[PDB]
Symmetry: D2
Subunit: 403 residues, 4 copies
C-alpha cells in the first residue's frame, strides 16, 4: 500500500521531494490541516528536523498511519476525482454571480444593516473532505434561519421522528397561508418556519437551564463543522430580543393552543430561540456542517458520526420543500437541492452524496433570499447534473463532476 | 472475442439452449425483450444444443447487452434476490384488505417492476387492464414539456402544491392552476397539447407517445369509463367554465372540446406490466429501457418527477414525500405509478382506496419498500442504517 | 267630506285649485286610488270650471278617506314640497360626481325617483329611461321565493350572511350553501326555488306578474339584447351552475342549465326609475303597494329581504354602506341603486358609470348625502338627531 | 293649570287624594319612586307627612309636573306598561325552562355561578322599569363592555379617528381566527383584537388608574348612577390566563396597529380591567336605554354620548355583537345586542328601551341559552325587529299603541 503509492508519486527517481508530495496532496482538494491527516503531517514535520527528500522507508514511516485515506486520494477515488477542474467551474460561477449586485441588505436590526453589500463568499466541502473557497469565506455571520434545519436534526437525533412530529408538521403551508402560525391540526406547519422552529427549540434538552441547552447545541454544531469556527453574536442576540414582537406573538399563541411539551417556560424558550439565531459561522465552517448532512450524518473531515440517518433524511426532506421561504416551491422545482436561507444572506446548501456548500452575500431579494446565492444555485444546477431528479446516466449537456 | 468470452462463462464443450435461456432469465431480462429480438430470431431459426460457432452466430448482434447482463453490470445485479423481497412485500400488503372501491373485485392486487436496464418482475394481477385516470397526468405533462418547453407550459400552470387548506380552490394567486397534478392544472395541460388539430388526432398522438413510453406493451381505451366520466364530471365542467372566464386557456381554445379530450385521456387503459415500463422510462432519463429509444427530453422527465414528488398523492402528497420520498402518482381505479430514479419503475394496482383516494395496499407496499431499501430520495448511498441496498 | 270642502274653500272652489292643492301633497292625479274622483271630475266638466258644496261631494266621496289624509297633512312626509326641494339639491350635488366607468348607455344619464309609503311621488333627471335591473332583481325574487315557500324552506338552500371580504370569490359557505341571496350563486339557487315543476315561460310570466303588482302596474319590460349578451358571456355563472350541481345545492329534479337561462332572463328585466321607486316603496310599506293598496308580499318576505339588503346589498361596499348609510339598498351593473327607507319611502337612483366596486358613483354620493341631511339611518334616533332634518314632522 | 288638571284626574271627583293612591297610580306608569327626575316631588312628600289637598299636592308636584303629566296622560313610549310587563313575565318563565348550556369554567370566578340564575331587566327611553328574576346580582360585563368603550372612544375622538385603527365589519365566519383584515386593522370593535385597539385610544397619556376612573365615571352616567363595580378576582384570573390576548397584543404591536407611544402591556392590563367591571341587570338595562335614547340617560335626562357614538355603536352591535351567531341574530332578531361570557346580553330596542338579560349557561357559540331564547320570543311577539314595518306587521303585538 505504502509502497504502491510510492511508485505512483515517484515514477522514476528513488526519492520523492517533500513539496512534490504536498502539492499532489493539495491538488486532490484535501487540506494539509485535515484532522484525518495529522499523524502523517506530524511525521513529516519531524522528518524535516531530523535530517527535503524521502526514500521508500522514510515515506513508509510518514504515511502508514493515514494510508487508507491517501490511497483513495491518489487513486482518484474521491467523489469528485478531477477536483481542480471542478473548482475552476465554481470560480467561474462565483464570478458570474458577482455581477448581480441588486437586492437589499437586511436592516431591521443594526447588526445586519452594517454588513457591506459586496461581501460574497462560497465554500465547498465534499463528503470526502475536499475543500474549496472563493471570496469572503472567513468572515463571520449569524446563521439566522440557517440554524433551523440544524436544531431540527438535533431534535430528531435525540428524540426520534415520531415524538418531534407530535409537535411540528411536515409540509409547506402553501403561499396564501405563509402567515398562519398553525395548520388545521393545530401544529406549526413545519420546522423551517418561525413557529415550527420555536416549538422545535422547546423540545431540545428539556429540564435544564438555557446555558446548558445552549452549550449542548454548541457542542453539537462543533462536531458538525469538524471543530471549525462556531461563535456567538451577543449584539445580534440583544437586538433580536428587543424587537421580536412577532415571535412573542407566536409564543403566546402556541402557549394558548397547547403546542409545547408540558412544563415549558415559553418566555425562556423564546430567549433560547433568539440565542440560536445569533450563532455565528463562516462560509468555511458552515460548508462542513452542510457536508455532514450530505454525508449521512458523518462529518467528512473527522469521520465522526454526529447525527442519525433518520435525523439527516428528515432534515434534507424538509429543506427541499420548506427551505427558501415563499420561493421554496420554485427552488425545489428549478434547483431541486435541500437548501436553507437566512436573513444575514447565507444559503446552506446540500448536494446529497456529493458535497455541502455555504453561499453568503447579505443583499436579499423581495422573498428574503440572497440574490447572489440564488443566482449561483441556479447556475450550479444548470452546469452539473445535481438536481434531485436529474438522471445519472442520461443528463443531456450537463457535466457530471463524479466521472 | 466478446462472444467467445461469454461462451466460456456459460459453459463443457456444448451449451444446451434451455440452459442459456434460464441463465438469461435469471438476470431478469425477458426473452421477448425487443433489444434481444435478433438473438431470439436466430435461435428460433436453428431449432437443442449449441457449439461455440453457432452460439456466436445467434448472440453476436445483441452481444453488448448480453455481456452486461451476465456481467451483473445491471443496476440490480442480484435480481433473483431482489424479486424475493418484492414478493414478501406484495404478500404483506395483500393482507391490507381495508378501504373502499370507487363507484372490479376488491381482491385484485398486482405489482410490476421494470428496472432502467429492462429487468422485469410481476406478482399478482398484473395483466388485467384498468384506467390510468389521474396516473395519466404526469404522462401528459411530460408530453407537453417535451413538445413546448418548461417556460411555455408554466405560463398556464403552477409548480407547487396548494397546501391542505387549499385543496378546493382552482387557481393560485397568479390566476393559474396550482400544478399539473390536480384536475384544474391537468385540464389546462390538456389544452396545450397538439394545438390546432382536432381531438381524434390529438388522442392518436398521445396514444402513439404512450406506446413508446411503454415500449409497445398494452395501451388501450375504455369507452365505458369515458361515457361515465363525461356524464358525471360536473366538477370538471365547473373547472372548465372557471378557467375560461379567468382566461387560463391558450388563445383559440374550444373549452368543451378540451373536456372531452380530458375525459378521454383519463379513460386510457394499461396493465401493471405496461405501466411499469412507462414508469421505468421516467426513471431512465426519458429513454425507454426495453427498446433503447428516447421518448422524452431530460427536461420533461426532471419536471415531471419533481411535480410527482410534491403533488402526486392528493392530500397525502406531503406525508408521502416525507416518509417515502419517491415520485409517485395515484389514480381512482387503484393505480400507483411509482418511479425510483436511476433504478426502476413500478405500477401497483389494487382498487380499494383509503379516505384520501389512494390505493390502500399500494400505499402499504410503498412504505414497506422504502423501509426495506435505501430508495428514499434523501437516503445516503454510503451510510444508511439497517436498510438493504439492492444496487451493491 | 263637507269638512274638506271648507278647508279648500267662498262657497265655490275652482277645479284647477283643487287639483293644484292635490298635487302639492305629492299625490299624482293618475293615482289608481283616486280614479273614481278623477273620473267624476272629468264627467262633471262635460256635464257643464267651478264646484258647489254638493257637486264636490259627488266627486270625492268614493275616495274621501285618502283625500282627508292628504289634506290634513297626515301623510308620512307632511311637507312634501320642502322635501322635494331637498331631493332636487342632492340630485344636483351628485350630478357633479362625473367619475366611474360605464359597464361593458350615456354616462350623462342620472335620475332619482321617490315613492313614499303613502303614494307621494317625485322625479328628477332621467327617470323615464328604461334600464335592466341586473342584480337589483335579486331581492325581488328572494322576496317572491320567501312569500311562496317560507323562510325555513328557502334558507335550507341559501345562507343569510355576507361572506366577508376575503370569502368574496368562494361560491359556498362552510355549510355548502351560497352565502346569501344577494350574490350570484345564492341568486342562482333562489331562482331554482321559484315555481318548481313548470317551464321557463310560465316561471317568467309568474315573476313578471309579481313585479307588475310591486310596481303598481308601471313599466316592467324585458331586454332581449341584454339577455343574449348575458348568456353568450356568462362563463362564471355556468361555472357556478356546475359547481352547485356537483355539491347538490339545487332542489331534487332541477334542470340546472334551464335555471341559468331563467336566471339570465330575470337579470334582463327592465324598469324605469319611476316604476322601480314604487317597487322599493312596496318593500318600505310592509309588502303593500302604496299606489294601489294591494298586498303583494308577506311581511316575513319583506323583513327577510330588507335584512339581507342591509348587510349584503352593495357588493364589497356592503359593510361600509351598512355603517355609513344604514339603509337596505341593492345595486346593479346598469347603474341602478334600489333603496328603501322603511316606514317612509322607496327610491331608485340610476347613473351608468360605476366605481371600482361596481356601484354607481352618483347613486353612492346621493345615498351618503341623503343620510347626512335626514335622520333615516337605521340607528338614527327619532327624538335626538343632532344637526339632521326629520321630514316626518 | 297643569298641577290642578292632574289633581282632578287622580282625585276622581273627591276633594282629597291619599298618598298611597298617588304612589300606586305613579308606579303603574312604570316609573319608580326613586327616579332621579322625581327627587323634588318625593322629597316634598317626605317633608309634609297621608291625605293631600289640591294645594298640598300642587306644592309637592310642581317641579316634576312636566314629567308626571306625560306619565298620567299615557304619553310614554309604552303607554300600557302594566300589560307589557306581564308579556315580559311570560317570556321570562318560558326561557326559564331552557336550562341547557355550559357555565363558563375556564377561570374560578365564572365557574362558580349557579346555572339557574336568570334575570331580565327593562328600561324604556322614558325611564319605565321592569325586572324579573335575579336582577340585583352583580356580574362582570366581559365582552358586553366592548360597545361601551367603543362609544366612549367615538364620543371623545370621533368616527374618523377611531376607524383609522379599527374596521367597521364582521370578518365572515371563517375568519374568526384572523386578528387583522386586509388593511392590517382589527375587523371591528366587537372582537378582542378590535377592543384592545379601542382600549388603547381612550384617554391617552395618563396612567391606567386615571383611565380606569374616567371610564368608570362614564359608565356611572350611562347607568344613571346605578350599580357599577369591579371584580379584582376576575381581573387577576383574566391577566393570568389571557395568553390569546397577549398573542393579539404582540401581533398588533408588530403590525403597528396601536397609536404612537403606546405601552402595549399596560393596555392589556387596562383591557382586562375593563372586562372585569361589574353591573347588575338593573343598572345595565339603563346603560342599554341610554343607547336606545340617542345618548341621553333616560332616568337622569343627562346627555352622556354624542349621536355619532350611539349610531356607530348600534350599527356594529347589529352586525358583530353575538360572536359567530352575529349574522343569524341580525337576520332573525334584528336588534343591536352584545353578549358576554358571564352570561349577559346587552340589548337595545332603538327608540323604545334597553334590556339586560343574564343567565350564566352559554351555548356552543358562547351566548346565553336563556337570553338567546328570550330575545327570539321577544321579537316573535312584538314588532321590534329593525325591519319590521310599523303599519303592516301581521299578528304581531306593537306595545307603543
Ligand atoms: O370550501 C368552501 C368554504 C370553506 C369551508 C371551510 C374552510 C374554508 O376556508 C378557506 C378559506 C379560503 C380559501 C379556501 C378555504 C372555506 N367553499 C368554497 N366555495 N367556492 C369554492 N371554490 C370555487 C371555485 C374555485 N374558486 C376559486 C376562487 C379563488 C381562487 N381559486 N378558485 C371558487 S370552495
Ligand atoms: O392577512 C390577514 C388577512 C387576510 C388577507 C388576505 C387574504 C387572507 O386569506 C386567508 C384565507 C384563509 C385563511 C387565512 C387567510 C387573509 N390577516 C391576519 N390576521 N391574523 C393572522 N394571523 C393570526 C396569528 C396566527 N393566526 C392563525 C389562525 C389560524 C391558524 N393559524 N394561525 C391568526 S394573518
Amino acid at each position: 500500500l505504502e509502497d504502491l503509492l510510492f511508485y505512483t508519486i515517484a515514477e522514476g527517481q528513488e526519492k520523492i521531494p517533500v513539496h512534490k508530495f504536498i502539492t499532489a496532496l493539495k491538488s486532490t482538494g484535501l487540506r494539509t490541516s485535515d484532522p484525518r491527516l495529522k499523524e502523517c503531517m506530524d511525521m513529516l514535520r519531524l522528518t524535516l528536523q531530523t535530517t527535503v527528500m524521502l526514500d521508500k522507508d522514510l515515506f513508509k514511516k510518514c504515511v502508514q498511519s493515514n494510508i487508507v485515506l491517501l490511497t483513495q486520494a491518489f487513486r482518484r477515488k474521491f467523489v469528485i476525482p478531477d477536483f481542480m477542474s471542478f473548482t475552476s467551474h465554481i470560480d467561474e460561477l462565483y464570478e458570474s454571480a458577482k455581477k448581480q449586485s441588486g437586492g437589499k441588505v437586511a436592516d431591521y436590526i443594526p447588526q445586519l444593516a452594517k454588513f457591506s453589500p459586496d461581501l460574497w463568499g462560497v465554500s465547498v466541502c465534499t463528503v470526502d473532505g475536499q475543500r474549496h473557497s472563493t471570496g469572503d469565506t472567513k468572515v463571520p455571520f449569524c446563521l439566522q434561519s440557517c440554524v433551523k434545519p440544524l436544531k431540527y436534526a438535533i431534535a430528531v437525533n435525540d428524540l426520534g421522528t415520531e415524538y418531534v412530529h407530535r409537535y411540528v408538521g411536515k409540509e409547506p403551508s402553501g403561499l396564501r397561508f405563509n402567515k398562519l402560525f398553525l395548520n388545521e391540526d393545530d401544529k406549526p406547519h413545519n420546522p423551517m418556519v418561525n413557529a415550527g422552529a420555536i416549538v422545535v427549540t422547546s423540545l431540545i434538552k428539556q429540564g435544564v437551564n438555557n446555558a446548558e441547552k445552549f452549550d449542548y447545541v454548541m457542542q453539537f454544531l462543533n462536531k458538525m463543522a469538524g471543530n471549525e469556527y462556531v461563535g456567538f453574536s451577543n449584539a445580534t442576540f440583544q437586538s433580536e430580543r428587543e424587537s421580536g414582537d412577532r415571535n412573542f406573538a407566536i409564543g403566546y399563541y402556541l402557549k394558548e393552543k397547547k403546542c409545547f411539551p408540558e412544563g415549558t417556560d415559553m418566555v425562556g424558550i423564546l430567549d433560547f430561540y433568539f440565542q440560536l439565531c445569533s450563532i455565528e459561522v463562516t462560509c468555511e465552517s458552515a460548508s462542513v456542517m452542510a457536508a455532514t448532512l450530505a454525508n449521512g450524518g458523518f462529518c467528512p473531515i473527522t469521520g465522526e458520526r454526529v447525527l442519525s440517518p433518520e435525523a439527516v433524511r428528515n432534515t434534507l426532506s424538509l429543506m427541499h420543500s420548506c427551505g427558501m421561504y415563499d420561493f421554496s416551491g420554485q427552488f425545489a422545482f428549478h434547483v431541486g437541492l435541500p437548501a436553507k436561507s437566512g436573513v444575514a444572506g447565507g444559503i446552506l446548501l446540500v448536494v446529497p452524496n456529493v458535497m455541502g456548500m455555504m453561499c453568503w452575500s447579505p443583499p436579499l431579494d423581495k422573498m428574503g433570499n440572497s440574490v447572489k446565492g440564488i443566482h449561483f444555485c441556479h447556475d450550479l444546477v444548470s452546469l452539473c447534473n445535481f438536481h434531485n431528479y436529474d438522471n445519472l446516466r442520461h443528463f443531456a449537456k450537463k457535466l457530471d463532476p463524479r466521472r
